[PDB]
Amino acid sequence: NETIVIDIKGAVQHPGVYEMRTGDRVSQAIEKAGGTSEQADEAQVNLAEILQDGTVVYIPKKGE
Amino acid sequence: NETIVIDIKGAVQHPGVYEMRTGDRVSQAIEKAGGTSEQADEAQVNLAEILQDGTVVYIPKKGE
């Protein structure tokens, strides 16, 4: 199969575990998770990294 | 398939994640992102580097 699961913790509206398509990107996970939280610092996160399976996508908070 | 996705952080008008054609250039990403910000320093960035997939394109600010 060509589906994937991802753990989306950090500064997002609905952190949790989501199922993505095999070739998706971090920017898609954040959208899948409702969207970014108003305390997030996306500058140090690569939003076009290919999502690997059974991995974490942490969205840092400003000042971390 | 022959498309690509790119992270455009830095001094641009619309930073974010954009989809480029496989053989595009940094000068094209900047234009796709609305254009340079009025605080950008184009001297320290190579504007015809081949865009690689799932990578960041940081546009420094003057004085960085």
Residue numbers in the entry:
A (entry chain A), B (entry chain B): 59 to 122
What do the authors of the reporting publication say about this deposited model?
ComEA, a DNA-binding protein widely conserved in transformable bacteria, is required for this uptake step. Following this contact with the tpilus, the movement of tDNA into the periplasm is driven by its interaction with the widely conserved periplasmic protein ComEA. A ComEABs contains an N-terminal transmembrane region, a previously unidentified OD, and a C-terminal DNA-binding domain.
To gain mechanistic insight into the function of ComEA, we cloned, overexpressed, purified, and determined the X-ray crystal structures of ComEABs and ComEAGs to 3.20 Å and 3.05 Å resolution, respectively. No electron density was evident for the ComEABs DNA-binding domain or linker region, but there was clear density corresponding to a previously undescribed domain (amino acids 60–122). There are seven of these domains arranged head-to-tail in the ComEABs crystallographic asymmetric unit, and we named this region the oligomerization domain (OD). We measured this in vivo by comparing B. subtilis transformation in strains containing wild-type ComEABs; ComEABs-D111N, which disrupts a conserved intermolecular salt-bridge between D111 and R83 (corresponding to ComEAGs Asp113 and Arg85); ComEABs-A106Y (corresponding to ComEAGs-A108Y), which sterically blocks OD multimerization; and ComEA-ΔOD, containing a deletion of the entire OD, while leaving intact both the transmembrane region and the DNA-binding domain. In comparison to wild-type ComEABs, ComEABs-D111N reduced B. subtilis transformation nearly 100-fold. To begin to understand the importance of ComEA sidechain interactions to DNA binding and ComEA function, we mutated some of the corresponding interfacial residues in ComEABs (e.g., ComEABs K164 and K193) to alanine and tested their effect on transformation in B. subtilis. Western blot analysis showed that wild-type ComEABs and the ComEABs proteins containing mutations in the HhH motifs were expressed to similar levels.
